[PDB]
Write an enzyme that holds these catalytic residues in place. Sequence first.
Site, PDB file in Angstrom:
ATOM      1  CG  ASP A  46      -8.149   3.969  -4.421  1.00 36.76           C
ATOM      2  OD1 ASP A  46      -8.560   2.861  -4.391  1.00 36.76           O
ATOM      3  OD2 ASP A  46      -8.212   4.781  -3.442  1.00 36.76           O
ATOM      4  CG  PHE A  78      -6.079  -3.856   3.997  1.00 39.73           C
ATOM      5  CD1 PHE A  78      -5.588  -2.920   3.068  1.00 39.73           C
ATOM      6  CD2 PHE A  78      -6.145  -3.488   5.332  1.00 39.73           C
ATOM      7  CE1 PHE A  78      -5.108  -1.686   3.509  1.00 39.73           C
ATOM      8  CE2 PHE A  78      -5.588  -2.289   5.783  1.00 39.73           C
ATOM      9  CZ  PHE A  78      -5.093  -1.348   4.860  1.00 39.73           C
ATOM     10  CG  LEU A 138     -11.938   4.404   0.373  1.00 44.77           C
ATOM     11  CD1 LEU A 138     -11.439   4.908  -0.976  1.00 44.77           C
ATOM     12  CD2 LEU A 138     -13.123   3.483   0.172  1.00 44.77           C
ATOM     13  CG  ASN A 183     -10.665 -19.485 -10.447  1.00 44.09           C
ATOM     14  OD1 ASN A 183     -11.188 -18.690  -9.634  1.00 44.09           O
ATOM     15  ND2 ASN A 183     -11.286 -19.849 -11.546  1.00 44.09           N
ATOM     16  CD  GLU A 202      -3.031  -0.833   0.149  1.00 47.65           C
ATOM     17  OE1 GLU A 202      -3.901  -1.604  -0.052  1.00 47.65           O
ATOM     18  OE2 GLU A 202      -2.984   0.309  -0.463  1.00 47.65           O
ATOM     19  CB  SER A 254     -10.249 -18.498  -6.095  1.00 42.37           C
ATOM     20  OG  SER A 254     -10.474 -17.801  -7.289  1.00 42.37           O
TER      21      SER A 254
END
Length: 164
Positions: free
Chosen positions: A20, A104, A32, A132, A11, A117
């Site tokens: 972002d 997250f 965010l 996948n 991040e 998945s």
Amino acid sequence: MNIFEMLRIDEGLRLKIYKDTEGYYTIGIGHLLTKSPSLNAAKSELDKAIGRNCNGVITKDEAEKLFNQDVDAAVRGILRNAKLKPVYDSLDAVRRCALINMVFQMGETGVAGFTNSLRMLQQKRWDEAAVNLAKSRWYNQTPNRAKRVITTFRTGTWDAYKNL
């Protein structure tokens, strides 16, 4: 290596409001603020989040506080979620960090949508699940990060993060 070190590689740390990859207003370690186009709505969310008048700027300290809350909330969301909990419980410690990472980034909802998945991860079909997971908006929009998380699920080691 641990979840905080991992997410901080993914991040970054920014002390001033930023957009972002998605164009959304964010701050800190991927916190965010709003999906709304106004910097003003963002600022107001920021002040509400920190409990002070920030003017779009926070301290390291405030950044790590928000990071601690977000990781805590991610884990709790996993544990509260009918679709996620079973997969989480089935995984080893390292792979557990990879699912936390996805949650997250994308939220509970987003990840609970990776039906097939999830299924493969529970079954411990690592190579199959890796293929996948790659077939997603997620991988196509943020390929380097998706590939680090995917390798983590594939291998069960921290090798993707060694480099970084």
